[PDB]
Design a protein around this ligand. Sequence first.
Ligand code: CL
Ligand code: CL
Ligand code: CL
Ligand code: CL
Ligand code: CL
Length: 129
Amino acid sequence: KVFGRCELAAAMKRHGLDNYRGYSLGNWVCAAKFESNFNTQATNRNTDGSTDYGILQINSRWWCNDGRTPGSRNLCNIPCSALLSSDITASVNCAKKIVSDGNGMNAWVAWRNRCKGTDVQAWIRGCRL
Ligand SMILES: [Cl-]
Ligand SMILES: [Cl-]
Ligand SMILES: [Cl-]
Ligand SMILES: [Cl-]
Ligand SMILES: [Cl-]
């Protein structure tokens, strides 16, 4: 599924991500924009053989099982394919664990490089939330 901006913001809020670990909804929408362009089915292989999955490009090196990332963990206790669903529940639950791991949203390099410090409220501007 390719979400619209306000549609994703609403879904994220519905799933408790709004201000989770102190990160406002716009931060999460911005991260999703630059990780996946709002596409739940986005996958991208990393140079090291892991793959990033879904709306928030969650990495198989630590967070989900894809069966082809030797030496890796599955800390979200989910198959990586669950992170590709139209329903964002699995991605949100796993993102909550990632953002709690110590470095906040800096875990998402694209958030650090493209969202951090910016006017992230623009991402929820106009949305009926
Ligand atoms: Cl947009
Ligand atoms: Cl915001
Ligand atoms: Cl594996
Ligand atoms: Cl959803
Ligand atoms: Cl933080």
